[PDB]
Amino acid sequence: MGGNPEFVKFPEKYEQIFTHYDTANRANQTQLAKFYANEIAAESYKKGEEAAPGSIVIMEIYAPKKDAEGKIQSGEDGLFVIDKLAAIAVMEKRNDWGSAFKADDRSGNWGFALYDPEGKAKDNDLTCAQCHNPLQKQDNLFSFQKLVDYVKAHKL
């Protein structure tokens, strides 16, 4: 199982609590993503360019509507039309992860976990940290600039 749900728990009610800072097609061009940040993460990126301990960032991963020939349906706004939520990806930063949590599974101090829409760990063979690791300069977040831009443009 890619990620570490033993350490990175499912953040209950994130969609009602966290700040929704972006919606975008994923770069794979087959899924739609919505991005969320908890208060510590939002305050961190209002102050600087690194998330403080306690920061949690979430990407909801949506399967798009497709016709019977597999063609993805898009709006005139260019965003894929949502069929249903497929997965909930979680990054959580701590400066004191327990020794049982192997460093090679983390991107710096970010732990990863992938959940299904019902909050159960979702089977996968992804190497989360390995793909996020080369983005150290932007705190291992692909959506870094969208988060920075959002919290600069909105009040706490």
Binding residues for heme c: 26-27, 128, 131-132, 142-143
Nearer to ligand HEC, 73 or 130 (CB): 130
Helical H runs in the chain? 14-17, 39-47, 128-132, 144-153
- Tell me the binding residues: 26-27, 128, 131-132, 142-143
Q: Considering the complex, what minimum distance in angstroms separates the CB of residue 65 from ligand HEC?
A: 18
Q: Is 19 left (phi over 0), alpha (psi -120 to 50) or beta?
A: beta
Report the C-alpha gap between 9 and 92 in whole angstroms.
9
Nearer to ligand HEC, 67 or 125 (CB): 125
Q: Considering the complex, what minimum distance in angstroms separates the CB of residue 68 from ligand HEC?
A: 26
Report the C-alpha gap between 113 and 1 in whole angstroms.
9
Which residues make up the interface to ligand HEC (CB under 6 A)?
2-3, 26-28, 33, 35, 57-59, 89-91, 112-114, 124, 126-128, 131-132, 141-143
Which token pair is 25? 């097609």
